[PDB]
Amino acid sequence: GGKTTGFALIYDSPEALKKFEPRYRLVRAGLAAKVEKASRQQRKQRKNRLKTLRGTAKVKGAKAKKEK
Amino acid sequence: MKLNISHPANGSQKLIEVEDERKLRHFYDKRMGAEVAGDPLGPEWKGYILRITGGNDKQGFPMKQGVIAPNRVRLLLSEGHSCYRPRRDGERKRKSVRGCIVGPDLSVLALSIVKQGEQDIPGLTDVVHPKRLGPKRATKIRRFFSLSKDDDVRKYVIRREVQPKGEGKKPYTKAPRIQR
Amino acid sequence: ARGPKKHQKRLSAPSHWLLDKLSGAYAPRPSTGPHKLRDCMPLIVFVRNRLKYALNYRETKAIMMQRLVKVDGKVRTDITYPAGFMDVITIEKTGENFRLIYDTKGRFTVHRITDEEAKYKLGKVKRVQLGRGGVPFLVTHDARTIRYPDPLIKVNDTVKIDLETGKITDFIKFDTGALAMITGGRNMGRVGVITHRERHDGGFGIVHLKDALDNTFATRESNVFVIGSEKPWISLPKGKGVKLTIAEERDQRRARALAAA
Amino acid sequence: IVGASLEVIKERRSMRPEARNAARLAAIKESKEKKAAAQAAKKAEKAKNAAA
Amino acid sequence: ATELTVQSERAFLKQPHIFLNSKVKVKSTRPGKGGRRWYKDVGLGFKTPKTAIEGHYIDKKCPFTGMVSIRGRILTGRVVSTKMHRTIIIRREYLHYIPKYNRYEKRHKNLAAHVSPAFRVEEGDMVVVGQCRPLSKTVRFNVLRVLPRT
RNA sequence: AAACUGCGAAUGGCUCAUUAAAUCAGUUAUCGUUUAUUUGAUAGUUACAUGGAUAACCGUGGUAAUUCUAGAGCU
RNA sequence: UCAUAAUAACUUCUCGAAUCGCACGGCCUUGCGCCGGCGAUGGUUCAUUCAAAUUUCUGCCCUAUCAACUUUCGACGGCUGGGUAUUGGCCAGCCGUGGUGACAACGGGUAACGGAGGGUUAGGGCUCGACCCCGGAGAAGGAGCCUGAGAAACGGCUACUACA
Ligand SMILES: [Mg+2]
Ligand SMILES: [Mg+2]
Ligand SMILES: [Mg+2]
Ligand SMILES: [Mg+2]
Ligand SMILES: [Mg+2]
Ligand SMILES: [Mg+2]
Ligand SMILES: [Mg+2]
Ligand SMILES: [Mg+2]
Ligand SMILES: [Mg+2]
Ligand SMILES: [Mg+2]
Ligand SMILES: [Mg+2]
Ligand SMILES: [Mg+2]
Ligand SMILES: [Mg+2]
Ligand SMILES: [Mg+2]
Ligand SMILES: [Mg+2]
Ligand SMILES: [Mg+2]
Ligand SMILES: [Mg+2]
Ligand SMILES: [Mg+2]
Ligand SMILES: [Mg+2]
Ligand SMILES: [Mg+2]
């Protein structure tokens, strides 16, 4: 046929739209940019790797000098 | 067999290498937490008395106060014991610790200075290190400076200075947010 | 089984919620509160599935965080809050008030009420006795306890609640000739007048009612809820709970359809 | 302590009571005049705003 | 029932919280208040027998002058064994229906109940029992009424 | 950020080895008991504010080896 | 012998707020004085909610080449206690001799988790159900325990056996 059916939302102000709309819809319209992230497994693998360090896990190279 | 010597008064620590056994003979058969004289270590140690605090075995196990044995024993360490850090509420784990009787088997001793001698140590007692933090509670601030009941404890807190990374601006001051 | 449950499986939820068997595997699992789990009205089901104000689960909690919706004059902020019989739901921003009441088919329906009527409630009394210090008190069907009540009030009666100060203002005795609405059983939602009551020592007494159209039915005492003597105090929904048979419903359906169009 | 060298601590603990007494009197009046200034500023401003 | 003596045991048998040594004497109609024997009424149209109120026996499991409440089912049966001490066995008979063959068959069950010294029970008599809390390994009912003999 | 403290981790998901009045089904009882959380009520017998510890952090180490840990100094 | 109240006493003995965030206000003896709003987090008892543990009645497949069974060291009941969140032969002492069975007990088989239900149909039936919903049990085989409102927990700990 030549008929099409969908859904529509009309917002009071442009600022009210960005407050309630989901992010993925914003990317479709081009208002907002996409989020850059790593894969789901790489994020999970990194999370479990940091469970073996206690305190100031950002830099842990101090243990390289123990062997001399 | 290394020695770890610490100076609580000056807040300084040092590590020395000792290879001659007859100097270490007087340390043997002593218990953890006892008093010993440092004279056999050398002429520079005259007038010094030291306190035995702990040590490590050759395999790496630490000494535990309260167990009388020259060898090492397996124990069921609960929460609150010395060489155990539980990972879960109510957890109990069986571990192995080395006794509190000093012997030739251990690899490192830990000991501290109780009484200063006439001579100085080249790298231990000739330098001092400052404290890190001042008091934060309200009553402790008053006692430290011997203030009266109403002396505006706000004004007497210790404040240091810090500056940004490379902004070129002036440094500012930091304060501890008095509690109680 | 090693503790209490926290999940509700779809296809096991109460039937009167009218939930589709597809589109997911779980159900809202109403939280603990003043009303029983079997017969309650979770707020998310009311807002999203009946009023259709919120599209999905994510936006249902967005409304609640703004404290827009309140029940019995006090704002509630959890989506799975168990509402029940006689509760008053007020949304000030849109400007209407709701009362939760059964229809003739045994399920909750939307029912507009005026602002003047949305400031009082009524509930069945559960027990009367002396508390700590000798102070008398009673508890209603929605876990409201009130001290210093009228000594004439006994169990199984109903009391009008101010809902602003929580004080009893008038009451109705439980006796023959009263007007009552059923809350449980197969005769759920019917409205009738108590004809007479028969009691059995050892529990489970029964009462006989009579409909407006001279129909007759019976129910256990635990399912009868007095709402008035004559001219019921609350505003009844459309149909007044008369329970037309299946023959009349299709007769009425086509008569209404052809008359309008 | 790192914040104050040893000369600072004993200087502050051994300050004579006369200096401390002056500090209390200087501070107590500073707040009093500060409080009074805010009290008069608000009461007069509301009068002219109401009039015009 | 036939009991030779009331105090024939290691300890002293008495109803709890019934004070018996008072200097002043006061006469009251109430059962437990004045210091005389205590008893209650079970209900459900069950009348306290005369032997209970005026008897001297001590029993902590009797529905009358005891610490047991009766609630639940009420059943009937015929006694088949009376050879224990204050305990009897009753026999209940019924008919089970087999659907395929469209007819019934006989079945029976055995029940254990506690009998109070107020009643006198013989073999082959019909009794009425009421449910109570567990009093033993296999005793959960209490005798209430003894039907008259033919 | 880190670390102390509070809460959760006893729900979910998987499987059918054991089990023949046992599990289980419909129907009763708790006047024979425990109950975090939610909801509603409810407690008149130096004070303008009490006392000692500990982690993160700084610094000195051990063991081939693990989400192992020692002794010293602040709050 | 309930709710609740009163009296004589008792206790390594409790609880009755030394906690936190927004607003910037009002009195006159103007003292760095007094009073005052709404929330968060806690707290003793009763009620409620999600429950949980025990408990009444009736109902399960084949087998007699299974006919008598249960009490050494509780098997059925009485009494005084001990223990448990509580009842109870659940356990300790003392005293009686009972309890189930041809209306099929007791024992052996099950290529047996139970139920809602699936397949096949004149009616009556025969057969299957590990499996999306509800209840129970288990985490290689056995036992023991810590924390907690809730576990005899195993993506928690201790020991032996078997693997590694
Ligand atoms: Mg009842
Ligand atoms: Mg919580
Ligand atoms: Mg927990
Ligand atoms: Mg589960
Ligand atoms: Mg699978
Ligand atoms: Mg509360
Ligand atoms: Mg009482
Ligand atoms: Mg007993
Ligand atoms: Mg026989
Ligand atoms: Mg089967
Ligand atoms: Mg099997
Ligand atoms: Mg199955
Ligand atoms: Mg199988
Ligand atoms: Mg399949
Ligand atoms: Mg396996
Ligand atoms: Mg907890
Ligand atoms: Mg398990
Ligand atoms: Mg296990
Ligand atoms: Mg696993
Ligand atoms: Mg698990």
UniProtKB/Swiss-Prot annotation, chain A:
Signal sequence interval, chain numbering = none
Residue ranges of the region described as Disordered: 37-68
Gene Ontology cellular-component annotations: cytoplasm; ribonucleoprotein complex; ribosome
Alphabetized, the UniProt keywords read:
Cytoplasm, Methyltransferase, Ribonucleoprotein, Ribosomal protein, Transferase
Q: Which domain of life is it from?
A: Eukaryota
| Any GO BP | methylation
- Localization annotation: Cytoplasm
Biased region (Basic residues) positions are 40-52
Q: Name one GO molecular function term.
A: structural constituent of ribosome
Chief site of localization: cytoplasm
Which protein family is named in the record?
Answer: Belongs to the eukaryotic ribosomal protein eS24 family.
- Whom does it interact with, and what assembly results? Component of the small ribosomal subunit. Mature ribosomes consist of a small (40S) and a large (60S) subunit.
Name of the featured protein: Small ribosomal subunit protein eS24
